[PDB]
Amino acid sequence: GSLTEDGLSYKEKFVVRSYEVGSNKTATVETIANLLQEVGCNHAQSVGFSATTTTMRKLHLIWVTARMHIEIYKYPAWGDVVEIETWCQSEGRIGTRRDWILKDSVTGEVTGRATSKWVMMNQDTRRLQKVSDDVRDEYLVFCPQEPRLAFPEENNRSLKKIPKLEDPAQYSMIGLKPRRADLDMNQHVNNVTYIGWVLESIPQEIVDTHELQVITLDYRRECQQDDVVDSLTTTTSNDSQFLHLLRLSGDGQEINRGTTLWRKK
Amino acid sequence: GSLTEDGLSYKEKFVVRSYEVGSNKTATVETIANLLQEVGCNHAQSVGFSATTTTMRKLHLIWVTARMHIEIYKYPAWGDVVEIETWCQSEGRIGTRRDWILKDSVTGEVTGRATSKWVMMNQDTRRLQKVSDDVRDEYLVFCPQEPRLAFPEENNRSLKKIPKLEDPAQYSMIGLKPRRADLDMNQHVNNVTYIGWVLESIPQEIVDTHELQVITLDYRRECQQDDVVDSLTTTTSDSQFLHLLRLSGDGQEINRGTTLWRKK
Ligand SMILES: NC(=O)[C@@H](O)C1CCOCC1
Ligand SMILES: NC(=O)[C@@H](O)C1CCOCC1
């Protein structure tokens, strides 16, 4: 991969692997989400990060994902080349945003797009905070100055408020636990794992007859390595919509909430 | 990737990804095993196998992994380029073997090696059988004629008999279940997932102070999408462990194995 000519965005190509595809012989949404995470990581490395700056490290500060929104029009097939372009943007003192555009390498057509909201937090106390001016200036030299949005629309799905699923849930998948493959290099549960856990409570019949078009996921609390999770889903709706909830198996402490939109195959 | 000049083996390079590494910032054994599986699929595609032959499809026959043995000397770091060479071999009517050699792209040094034993079976009845004769012919044109072994030493770790772990196990991880990411394109549990489940019963302290050097795994029965598994481990000793994967209810055996670990 490489930064574009202006140095304000980063591009990388990926060839879809055999174990990365589902029953349709096309990449899963978890494969897509892992690839977005990989291109984001390579973008940070290319401009001297890690995404902590020198000031953030001095104050034990980290960037944390608050929301992830993905819309896929076409899943790349096994063996296809997918090109992803990503960039970051400052959102004042609220936090930062990372956007992605997915394209078919052969045709150049947009096959998907994603946006994520990030908030600043003390690594030890877990206390969120607004962005300091010294930090804001340090990453503004790597972001475009004029707004560049993957989701520019007037009232788009990426910014919609998500409600809390009420008991009883229509569907559920109980006793989900992360294994070592679900942990990143810092022994924290990978953000993509939660996408998988949310989808576990979608019945196999929807999965077999529909394609996932949109997923919006809020991250409220982290699942520890020794925590057990319950995945809850209720139909809110040819299209099918669902409301999701991930909560701890015991006390019922909320860890995630989301919505998915599916279309008939 | 591409087949070598003689067309009897296949090579592919891979750049290690951020989510593919563990605490040591080096690729996990599950990442390694996924890469071997990927180079194996690309080798089959390149010689027209889509690993069923023409006669196997009409007869409802498939190749199934019976044993997987992996020995790693150095795990590639995040960002490194690893080159893997793989080839197949006929083992008479017992079955077939697929071997791999892992190398550092920059130095050309061997950083690991793997071998797998495969058996033939009817995909419906799940009944094993001796390969054939008219099927051996179709495979032998894509394999080297003289023996080429990733593990050539006479009576080596890859061919050792594995015993059954006796209850009570020293360590255990119970209630393991596969999710959709653990399934392949045919809705079967990926063979690499069982490697992960075996390692789940190794205490975090061994993982934090040792590096996995060798793993040998026997595949006895498949875990269905709706099955629950218990992972059992006992120290037999470097550190060595004996492993058992069995169904959470009846205790039906699905895998057995051994791992050897070195102090970091
Ligand atoms: N590192 C990242 O960009 C993560 O926060 C994302 C990656 C895509 O899946 C959702 C979480
Ligand atoms: N397809 C294959 O080569 C599999 O049978 C292997 C892959 C890596 O180790 C576990 C089993």
From Swiss-Prot, chain B:
One of its GO terms (cellular component) is chloroplast. GO terms for biological process: fatty acid biosynthetic process. It is an enzyme of class 3 (hydrolase). Belongs to the acyl-ACP thioesterase family. It catalyses: (9Z)-octadecenoyl-[ACP] + H2O = (9Z)-octadecenoate + holo-[ACP] + H(+). Plays an essential role in chain termination during de novo fatty acid synthesis. Possesses high thioesterase activity for oleoyl-ACP versus other acyl-ACPs. Substrate preference is 18:1 > 18:0 > 16:1. Keywords: Chloroplast, Fatty acid biosynthesis, Fatty acid metabolism, Hydrolase, Lipid biosynthesis, Lipid metabolism, Plastid, Transit peptide. The keyword Chloroplast applies. It is found in: Plastid, Chloroplast. Its EC number is 3.1.2.14. The active site is at residues 186, 188, 223. This is Oleoyl-acyl carrier protein thioesterase 1, chloroplastic. One of its GO terms (molecular function) is fatty acyl-[ACP] hydrolase activity.
